[PDB]
Design a protein around this ligand. Sequence first.
Ligand SMILES: *C(=O)[C@@H]([C@@H]1NC(C(=O)O)=C(S[C@@H]2CN[C@H](CNS(N)(=O)=O)C2)[C@@H]1C)[C@@H](C)O
Length: 241
Amino acid sequence: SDVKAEKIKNLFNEAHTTGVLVIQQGQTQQSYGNDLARASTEYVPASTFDMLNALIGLEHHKATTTEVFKWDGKKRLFPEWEKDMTLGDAMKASAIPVYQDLARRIGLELMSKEVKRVGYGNADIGTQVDNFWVVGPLKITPQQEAQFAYKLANKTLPFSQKVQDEVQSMLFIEEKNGNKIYAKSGWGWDVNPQVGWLTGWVVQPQGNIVAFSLNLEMKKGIPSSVRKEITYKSLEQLGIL
Ligand SMILES: *C(=O)[C@@H]([C@@H]1NC(C(=O)O)=C(S[C@@H]2CN[C@H](CNS(N)(=O)=O)C2)[C@@H]1C)[C@@H](C)O
């Protein structure tokens, strides 16, 4: 237990940054890493907000799981985004232009109501429906992200079963040794310091759900791939994977 925690602390150290990993099983959360105080600190959710954006958009018939969001031909931050996408394609790619489109369809009034009804982080979306989850004012703690993931995994969020099922399917990564992994990454590259997320859950073979939220400082020039590496190795050290 002490030896498991020390090994996870050293994963963050050897990436030359500070980070926390929150684990939820049942109604119990545990924090690991080299800055445990991050667990209860508010950060912009960045692309992790896509999960709630998708729930709200599908619940209120603003979009479907099959409709294609056409690329308008304008240069995007990543060349990989420069293509026609479904919501699920955009979830996997974290293609924010698709989720900005969806946010505008929802509109500020409905988005504010739904974020408050769910109780997501500080539940403050300010005045711009297509600019609140990357540079503020919306903030959320890793503890709150892990709790949100656990509820989505169990379909106990206050949305239809149908829409929670559809958003789970968008977040599915892989089955590994009988374990099903669901995850959304985030990188708030435009706040100082920068924030990196990986929020999701494991379904273990007998059906036990282990929710997690990794939150770390995205140092200048840090490999974006390190968020997934630290998460998977940490879950392995904990005997979750
Ligand atoms: C959302 O937070 C942000 C997205 N999110 C991500 C992200 O990966 O979390 C990016 S980076 C872009 C998409 N994924 C590629 C990196 N994959 S990996 N395996 O980590 O190396 C490149 C982007 C900044 C929105 C707000 O832009």
